[PDB]
Design a binder for this molecule. Structure first.
Ligand code: CHT
Ligand code: CHT
Lengths: 193, 192
């Protein structure tokens, strides 16, 4: 009843924030899209920053559930790492929108401590996932010996950089090109020769 | 009057870097300088014109800075390490520049004049890195691996690490980013 009103507001706000930008989304844009009042929205989220914070929290959870679903039947660490990286591509739809929002979060983080803390915890979880995957492939003998933390740092960084090049329209860049670049890095920098 | 626009842009640049473009109202610029929203619009008809002219000014200053630093350097390995050092978000001017760039990546995905400006700027920088790699390959100090893909890799790595710095990743610092990049150059670019 009320938890349902919240989720709908957040789902709508996420999409609007992704496609129009957080500072260009007004409360009445959300209320119009859903048929509610500005007052209902204010009741659940007294400030716009609260809509962003709670929308991010909901999405980090959705995204992690997606990850769990995609990987649970995968035991080979190369296949796991390949899938993990695939889940990070800004493919058409929800993943492209998530990227759109994360780019905004990088900036808003430099200014809002709750957003900064949420982004860091979400980042850290991913970072540990990557590092853990590396150490499994190392134990399985399919990945080269190398410090997994430095490698998780590098892979994560490479991914974010490439995504920017996709979103900002760098000439020759596409999701297929990013995919190819990242698969080349895995095959030549991570996989055991 | 060339002096009034100058002050406006330098002030707007600093406020955008520190407060964020969407949080800077026109009266905020006026108060930092002592003037009115009207005078500000007199020189910049829209808020978006302020961001655009400021960015143009910055891109130029940064390219100048780069030419001054690379001027004499013949050795490609040294040129490359210097190019990379210029991208570090060191406290003060460079960190402020990164802050604006971060906003520009987002505004690019929505505004064409800004996307155009960012792509011409990024392409210049990217070709520079490419060129330098090819130089070191010819001099014999760098591994003969496709320079476009290496430059794509190094540029992406730079952006990603900068983000980790600016957003506060645990254990991240400007010096750690420097070491990571130098290690990338030394172990991935330089010829064993
Ligand atoms: C790689 N992404 C930016 C999509 C997620 C980080 O949380
Ligand atoms: C973020 N950099 C400073 C690397 C370049 C932006 O034009």
């Amino acid at each position: 009843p009320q938890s349902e009103a919240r989720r709908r507001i957040l789902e709508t706000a996420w999409r609007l924030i992704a496609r129009r930008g957080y500072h260009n989304v007004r409360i009445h844009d959300i209320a119009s899209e859903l048929g509610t009042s500005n007052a209902t929205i204010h009741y659940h989220f007294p400030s716009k920053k609260d809509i962003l914070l709670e929308a991010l929290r909901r999405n980090v959870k959705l995204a992690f559930d997606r990850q769990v679903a995609e990987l649970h039947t995968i035991a080979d660490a190369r296949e796991r790492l390949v899938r993990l990286v695939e889940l990070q591509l800004p493919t058409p739809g929800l993943l492209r929108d998530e990227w759109s929002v994360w780019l905004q979060v990088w900036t808003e983080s430099t200014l809002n401590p709750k957003i900064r803390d949420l982004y860091n915890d979400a980042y850290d979880r991913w970072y540990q996932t990557i590092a853990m995957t590396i150490r499994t492939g190392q134990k399985q003998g399919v990945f080269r010996d190398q410090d997994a933390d430095e490698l998780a740092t590098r892979l994560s960084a490479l991914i974010d950089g490439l995504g920017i090049q996709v979103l900002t329209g760098k000439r020759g860049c596409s999701v297929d090109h990013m995919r190819q670049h990242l698969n080349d890095f895995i095959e030549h920098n991570i996989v055991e020769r």
